[PDB]
Structure 1
Amino acid sequence: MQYNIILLVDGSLSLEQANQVNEKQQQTLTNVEGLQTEYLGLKELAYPIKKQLSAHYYRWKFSGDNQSTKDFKRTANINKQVLRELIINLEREYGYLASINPKKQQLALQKRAKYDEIIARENNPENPDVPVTSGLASTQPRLSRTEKAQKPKEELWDVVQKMGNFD
């Protein structure tokens, strides 16, 4: 199925040769292909592994047989041209949706209001707004109604009343 792969190439090396060897490593996927030729540019490893003070970052997004990415996890991680093969799919805690996209107006609103950049408004980033209307769209309702009204007798004033005039 859908597969995004974050690549960790070995040590410090040229960008293009690493791109080519990462393509060769993606070839280890039997049919998980349709890659878009792109990369994340240069990003160094924040800590030396034992002599690797830096590396290069590449992203490969494509789709294919889900069973046939385990062999990639073997080959990329074993062969000394990829160190980490990070895979994205549903087994990792998922939340994606192809129809929840119409919520990026909230994205613009939060980018505006993650920190209030105007002197007039300096509200905390964790304070309410309250245009509230309380939409539900999920109730599990049943429309029970009365059709036969027998024995007219109801209980509405069920609060006690006692102890009349006392001397």
Structure 2
Amino acid sequence: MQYNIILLVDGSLSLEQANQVNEKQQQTLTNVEGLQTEYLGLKELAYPIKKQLSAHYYRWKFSGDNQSTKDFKRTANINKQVLRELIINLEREYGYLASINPKKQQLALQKRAKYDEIIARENNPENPDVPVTSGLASTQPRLSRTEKAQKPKEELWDVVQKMGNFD
């Protein structure tokens, strides 16, 4: 399956916390594919969990069966630093089928590209952008809609009998 752990470890020193992450990696994950890891860095977290105002941030993007969670979830408390850990199963996050759908991905690219052109014009280098058109409504309809409009399945019928048809 595809899970995503976000580990939190104390801010002692980078290499030894990396070793802790490696230990936490090879011990658990009963059955697993490649466990690619990142390193978001040291950040000063808002609320001092355990009176701790620092932490190394790691992110794991592994994938595997549902059994990969139980030992890790238990090993975490049985572990050292591991202030927090969240296994965000991305097959249940708020929007995953659309993210896998190819057309929506390609559709998102043109909007990214197209939206960026508008923002540029608004914030022109120095010449005044009189339109300041962004949030406001657009011009006439998107002719492509009128052109590419669907055709309902128009069932064709054939005549058989008649009598008195004013027609």
Q: TM-score, normalised by structure 2?
A: 0.53
Name the count of aligned residue pairs.
167
> 1:15 touches 1:56 (CA, 8 Å); kept in 2?
no
Give 1:95 shift. 2.1
Q: Which blocks of at least 5 consecutive residues in structure 2 are unaligned?
A: none
Give 1:49 shift. 2.2
Structure 1 residues 127-136 or 7-16, which shifts more?
127-136
Report the 3-state secondary structure (helix = DSSP H, G, I; strand = E; otherwise coil) of the residue aligned with 2:98: coil
> 2:4 touches 2:90 (CA, 8 Å); kept in 1?
no
CA RMSD of aligned residues (A): 12.7
Structure 1 residues 32-41 or 67-76, which shifts more?
32-41
Q: Which residue of 1 aligns with 2:113?
A: 113
Structure 1 residues 8-17 or 126-135, which shifts more?
126-135
> 2:44 touches 2:53 (CA, 8 Å); kept in 1?
yes
Residue 144 of structure 2 is aligned to residue 140 of structure 1: no
**Counterpart-to-counterpart distance in 2, 1:63 and 1:50:** 31
Q: % of aligned pairs identical?
A: 100
Report the 3-state secondary structure (helix = DSSP H, G, I; strand = E; otherwise coil) of the residue aligned with 1:157: strand
Structure showing the higher helix proportion among its residues = 2
> 1:4 touches 1:61 (CA, 8 Å); kept in 2?
yes
Give 1:31 shift. 1.3
Q: Cα 1:156–1:63, aligned 2, differ >3 Å: closer, same or farther?
A: closer
Structure 1 residues 154-163 or 64-73, which shifts more?
154-163
1:82-117 CA-partner distances (Å, limit 9, x unpaired)? 122210215744421276555778997899799999
- Structure 1 runs (4+) deviating above 6 angstroms are 103-167
Which protein has the larger Cα radius of gyration, Structure 1 or Structure 2? 1
> 2:3 touches 2:90 (CA, 8 Å); kept in 1?
no
Q: Which blocks of at least 5 consecutive residues in structure 1 are unaligned?
A: none
Report the 3-state secondary structure (helix = DSSP H, G, I; strand = E; otherwise coil) of the residue aligned with 2:95: coil
